[PDB]
Design a binder for this molecule. Structure first.
Ligand SMILES: CC(C)CN(C[C@@H](O)[C@H](Cc1ccccc1)NC(=O)O[C@H]1CO[C@H]2OCC[C@H]21)S(=O)(=O)c1ccc(N)cc1
Lengths: 99, 97
């Protein structure tokens, strides 16, 4: 798809069988999701955003379908204003900015 | 141009002759930069880690990667300068995959 930016670039993702809405976020290095049902082991991590730092659970090697395209990578689970798909997974699905 | 996302999508911007680097950010509703005169309205914007207080300037002419845009620029303690959707739309930016 070609996604214009008059509205928030929100898409449906599928992550461990669950459907969620997430924001395609070119300003995000990392992918941050509010909650997820992955059975794997995880590691505690901290990340900073515009407002300060948060604690997240780092899951590696998570399978996620982003608007039909498969990605397999790191997902951070913690408090975000909205689920964000960052560059670590945008690169995988072949996303570029074009103007 | 086409900008891949292997690295942070940073471009040069220019305000009133003043050069800065800024992130082309589809996740940001509005453009926010760290640096002053003119009329401005108080605003708060939030993301990971909470909210920051910013000054809202309207109808600012900015040049983004060589393309002129006119619109809202927020000014405040953002850790990175951010070109948001309000101005990305004006330079005809899309996300493609
Ligand atoms: C979280 C989004 C819904 C909104 N953010 C835009 C976002 O692209 C920021 C933009 C950003 C970029 C760098 C530093 C702070 C904010 N990225 C971000 O928080 O990414 C985090 C996840 O990956 C990490 O990589 C960078 C920070 C971490 S935001 O910066 O808070 C923001 C919110 C409102 C406006 N108007 C402008 C910006």
């Amino acid at each position: 798809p070609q996604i214009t930016l008059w509205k928030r670039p929100l898409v449906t993702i599928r992550i461990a069988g669950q459907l969620k809405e997430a924001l395609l976020d070119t300003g995000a290095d990392d992918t941050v999701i509010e909650e997820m049902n992955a059975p794997g082991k995880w590691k505690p991590k901290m990340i900073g955003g515009i407002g300060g730092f948060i604690k997240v659970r780092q899951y590696d090697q998570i399978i996620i379908e982003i608007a039909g395209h498969k990605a397999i990578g790191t997902v951070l689970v913690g408090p975000t204003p909205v689920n964000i798909i960052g560059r670590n997974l945008l690169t995988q699905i072949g996303a570029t900015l074009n103007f």
